Amino acid sequence: GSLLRRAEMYQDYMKQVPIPTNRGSLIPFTSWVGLSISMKQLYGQPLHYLTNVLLQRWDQSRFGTDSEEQRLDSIIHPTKAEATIWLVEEIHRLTPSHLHMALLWRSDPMYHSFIDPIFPE
Amino acid sequence: GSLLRRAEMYQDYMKQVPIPTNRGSLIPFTSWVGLSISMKQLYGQPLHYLTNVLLQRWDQSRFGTDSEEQRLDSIIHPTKAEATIWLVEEIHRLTPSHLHMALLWRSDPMYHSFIDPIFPE
């Protein structure tokens, strides 16, 4: 039971934040974490713990390559880029239980660093 | 350096498998792992380690809920469902380095269980 009441409030909140249906034009970006900052600023909504943690791991997964430096938007186009993160986020606003998050949270000592603050109205 | 030559062959392979542009109609499914079996059978291609591991965790993330049993396709529509996994997979066929996979692999003692076999021609 530890973490539950916080993981309950946090998942009962995010499930309520609607995924935006009207989209803007292509957002240049150079990391997945960078891209998603551009989306919360522009659309004014938080992304879930699970979306911010998977995007740190997409970015981390690039280190170590042999190729020379290449902007990520030369690889993944900003149009499906954005779409991704709007699809990953929906799964996350709907499907996980709050017992899951408390679980994960009890195992990640930095979990609050992947939770967004309160956004404006 | 351990795992590299296998992680090299495996990521230099998957980056070459083209993501299918012609899509079929909606695939009913009841788990993300179930959905993606329906996609490899139907489209004849393997999904990456990183896509099969994230889909075990999407499914795992549902356990513990308070709601009664509900098919996942009552929550996420099979049309964006499929699209997801085609977007996650592309990121994975293009962006990770093979030093990343060997890293992950050295830390996951069951990594081969998330690698697909060889598919037909």
Which CATH number is A25's domain given?
1.20.120.690
**Alpha helices (runs of H) in A1-121, residue ranges in sequence order:** 4-14, 32-43, 49-60, 72-75, 78-94, 98-107
User: Residues with Cβ < 8 Å from A37, sequence gap 6 or more?
Assistant: none
Nearest-CA distance B92 → chain A (Å): 9
Task: Give Cα separations from A78 to A32, A69, A75, B93, B107 (angstroms).
Answer: 10, 18, 9, 17, 32
Distance CA B64, CA B62 (A): 6
User: Residues with Cβ < 8 Å from B22, sequence gap 6 or more?
Assistant: none
Q: How many domains are there within chain A?
A: 1
Full 3-state SS string of B43-94: HCCCCCHHHHHHHHHHHHCCCCCCCCCCCHHHHCCHHHHHHHHHHHHHHHHH
DSSP classification of residue A20: P
Is residue B59 within 8 Å of A94, Cβ to Cβ? no
Distance CA B72, CA B36 (A): 13
- Tell me the residue length of chain B: 121
Query: Given in angstroms, what resolution was this structure solved at?
Result: 1.6
> Dihedral of CA A116/A73/A31/B93: which sign?
positive
Tokens of A59: 């970015």
Residues 26-55 in B contacting A (C-alpha not used; CB under 8 Å): 50, 54
Residue of A nearest to B31 (CA): A95
Domain range holding A20? 1-121
DSSP classification of residue B114: G
Distance CA B119, CA A86 (A): 31
Distance CA B23, CA B44 (A): 13
Tokens of A77: 């186009």
State the Rg of chain B over Cα: 15
Tokens of A12: 């009962």
Distance CA A110, CA A115 (A): 10
Residues 97-116 in A contacting B (C-alpha not used; CB under 8 Å): 97-100, 103
Among partner residues B61, B76, B88, which is closest to A100 by beta-carbon distance?
A: B61
Distance CA B121, CA B114 (A): 21
